[PDB]
Design an enzyme around this catalytic site. Sequence first.
Site, mmCIF file in Angstrom:
data_model
loop_
_atom_site.group_PDB
_atom_site.id
_atom_site.type_symbol
_atom_site.label_atom_id
_atom_site.label_comp_id
_atom_site.label_asym_id
_atom_site.label_seq_id
_atom_site.Cartn_x
_atom_site.Cartn_y
_atom_site.Cartn_z
ATOM 1 N N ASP A 110 0.660 -1.220 0.008
ATOM 2 C CA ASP A 110 -0.110 0.252 0.028
ATOM 3 C C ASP A 110 0.902 1.166 -0.038
ATOM 4 O O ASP A 110 0.207 2.198 0.294
ATOM 5 C CB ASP A 110 -1.045 0.089 1.241
ATOM 6 C CG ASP A 110 -0.425 -0.521 2.343
ATOM 7 O OD1 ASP A 110 0.164 -0.023 3.304
ATOM 8 O OD2 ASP A 110 -0.367 -1.868 2.644
ATOM 9 N N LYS A 162 4.936 2.840 17.923
ATOM 10 C CA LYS A 162 3.521 3.455 18.052
ATOM 11 C C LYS A 162 3.730 4.677 18.491
ATOM 12 O O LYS A 162 4.742 5.219 19.321
ATOM 13 C CB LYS A 162 2.815 2.687 18.783
ATOM 14 C CG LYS A 162 1.880 1.533 18.294
ATOM 15 C CD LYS A 162 0.861 1.935 17.352
ATOM 16 C CE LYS A 162 0.760 1.573 15.968
ATOM 17 N NZ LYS A 162 1.735 2.163 15.207
ATOM 18 N N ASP A 218 1.387 6.628 1.580
ATOM 19 C CA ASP A 218 0.517 5.519 1.804
ATOM 20 C C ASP A 218 -0.613 5.739 1.276
ATOM 21 O O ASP A 218 -1.377 6.790 1.268
ATOM 22 C CB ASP A 218 0.229 5.077 3.195
ATOM 23 C CG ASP A 218 0.204 3.478 3.496
ATOM 24 O OD1 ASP A 218 -0.929 3.107 4.206
ATOM 25 O OD2 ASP A 218 1.000 2.598 2.975
#
EC number: 2.7.7.13
Lengths: 360, 406
Positions: A110, A162, A218
């Site tokens: 992607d 994260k 993306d």
Amino acid sequence: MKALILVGGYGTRLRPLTLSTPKPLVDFCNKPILLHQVEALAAAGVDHVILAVSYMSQVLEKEMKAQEQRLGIRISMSHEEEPLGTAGPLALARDLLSETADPFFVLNSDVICDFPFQAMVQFHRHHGQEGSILVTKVEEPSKYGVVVCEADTGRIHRFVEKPQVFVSNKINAGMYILSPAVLQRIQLQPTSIEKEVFPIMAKEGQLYAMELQGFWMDIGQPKDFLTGMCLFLQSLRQKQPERLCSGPGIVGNVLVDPSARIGQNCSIGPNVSLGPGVVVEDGVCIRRCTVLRDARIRSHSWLESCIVGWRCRVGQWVRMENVTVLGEDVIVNDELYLNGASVLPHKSIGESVPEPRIIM
Amino acid sequence: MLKAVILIGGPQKGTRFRPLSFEVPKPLFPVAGVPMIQHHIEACAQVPGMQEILLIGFYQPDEPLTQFLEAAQQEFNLPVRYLQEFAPLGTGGGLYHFRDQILAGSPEAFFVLNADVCSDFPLSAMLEAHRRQRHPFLLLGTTANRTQSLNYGCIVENPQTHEVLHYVEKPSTFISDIINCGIYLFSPEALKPLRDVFQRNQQGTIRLEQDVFSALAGQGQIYVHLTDGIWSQIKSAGSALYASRLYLSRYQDTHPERLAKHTPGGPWIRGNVYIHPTAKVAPSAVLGPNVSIGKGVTVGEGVRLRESIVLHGATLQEHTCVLHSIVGWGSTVGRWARVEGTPSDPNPNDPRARMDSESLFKDGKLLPAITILGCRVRIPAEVLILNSIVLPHKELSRSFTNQIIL
Ligand SMILES: Nc1nc2c(ncn2[C@@H]2O[C@H](COP(=O)(O)OP(=O)(O)O[C@H]3O[C@H](CO)[C@@H](O)[C@H](O)[C@@H]3O)[C@@H](O)[C@H]2O)c(=O)[nH]1
Ligand SMILES: Nc1nc2c(ncn2[C@@H]2O[C@H](COP(=O)(O)OP(=O)(O)O[C@H]3O[C@H](CO)[C@@H](O)[C@H](O)[C@@H]3O)[C@@H](O)[C@H]2O)c(=O)[nH]1
């Protein structure tokens, strides 16, 4: 050398578009996003690329065996019968690439960007360690995994998967080169490589970072898809000014497939990609929108920043905006207004959707 | 000999539920092509022996109103005069204050018409019943829903003799389904009870429904004539649009030359559409049902107009869509621009639904209704106006949704 594209299981992202076809099969600037990565892999000279898909799809097998001949390289497709995350693909591919001791490519499907593969292998050869990561500096590090950047050497001090720590604004770029030695380290049980392999590999300092030149985006999610197309057309204008269509009633950077017909008196705005075989009638103003193939847009209609699905029929005087997504074979009645409405395939629309909800 | 008194309002008393026009008077607002009181004037001029027409209301005489009087007097060959109250005297106070001007000539009876009603005007049928029985007050009555009847003035009658036994004005509880329609017939004796009410006010302003009708009800003085035809009240913008639809559907029986024909060489017309002769519409434009175009309007190439009212001098450019909206005069809509509104309408399951009107705010929330564009409002190109009220002389630059744009 060889190259592993992580196709994987079908995602919740881009779901009304990819209900008919898989996510790497959707036409992005008249090409599937499988095709862009295997294009630049064929320019890289890899004789063997491998897709790790988590559910078998016969139309995907059809398309890969079709492109297999003209692309000139052999394509092996290995199937995950139960999803092992993204680290488990290398564990099932371990017996498929263990014969060579030569660093391999891994790409996400992607991502769409400029592909610096020979500079990538030169950076990986010069740094000499096991794992080489490509990274990019962006707007917001809150959607991706943030790295730490060095001086001339480029050794990654620390990897974070994260966000909300905000240690840098750099993010992972989604394409790496990995060694055969790190593929020993990953077990066969399900885990995820970006979160759990890179986090112990960054402690010793084997991981290194290389930063992308242009227009990383993306495109897994539809508003990211639209901004990735709009960012692709800029660098496509700079690289190939001959592919972009120029016209008297056309403003901005427009790519039109030669099968497509466009009526007169209509204003195709900036950053618009028209699929092969679309029928745009007269008096239709389209800006920042990608229309997939076989889609007929009737007259006097306005469309800014949306995605039109395959074999679709948009009615007359229809206004669509805010990245509204239409599925395959969607009928929009005349004089309707769609704002933020992701539409499931094979459904006619008879009511205005002014407020951004998903329709049945 | 009969004259007819039209009770046009004042400027404060309009207090519009949605302001259909900020700059022109409400009785001069064009409903289905012609002004709102021109329907009353024409239906009164059809009645035999109509000598005069008076308009009582406390508007100051601006030149639009006097210019309309110039036009109407020579159009219908009747003297049409404007009698201005010195102060807001109520519904029946202006009738009593100007009793010397109405009573002069000794009319046999005289009509009283609310200006804001849009009706069949069966004035000859009321006149035949009045010539049969010669009773002082005759009221037009219509059948309404049980919920919708609390907004109007309810009438309880004897069904055999058609005489009002009880009258109540906007009751909190349900009383009867018949509602007063704002059309009355007054014998010359009927100015005598009004005078009586005036003396009780000294111990100026006489409300006709609350002080005359609701007090004398049942004493043999008020009689109701039931009717069948179309009736609506022009209170708000949406009710003005629905009244314009009613008149455009009524036009087939009376003025078939007013509605635009199909005309395959020219612009497409579906449904009932009034286009002015001075307005120039491009032949690619298609005008949907219940659409009125004003004088001097230049509807462009490719325009779609459905359920709209376009006032005089507005220009719409190419490929614009205008649905459920009132376009003020002189307003400009750019190309690919869309002006939309929400048709509240009337219930389709109810047997007698009368299309209520609500004053701009449901319970502290702005409710979706007909889009109003003020006079000389410039809507720019490729922009969306949705459920909005735009004040006059304002040029927008971006899209607006569910807003009053000051
Ligand atoms: N073989 C396999 N591949 C998979 C699987 N799941 C996902 N993939 C592939 O892995 C890629 C990442 O999928 P996402 O789930 O959308 O990841 P993300 O939330 O976007 O985050 C990842 O990508 C970001 C860039 O897009 C990175 O910034 C981030 O660090 C992380 O690697 C997708 O192209 C998908 O096709 C799977 O179960 N099996
Ligand atoms: N001259 C004058 N006229 C007035 C005045 N106030 C109102 N009018 C006019 O008198 C008519 C009715 O006035 P309203 O007091 O606003 O009545 P309503 O709330 O609209 O309801 C009346 O009409 C309904 C049908 O339209 C009836 O059903 C109801 O019974 C009532 O008579 C309107 O045309 C208004 O313009 C005034 O002070 N002076």
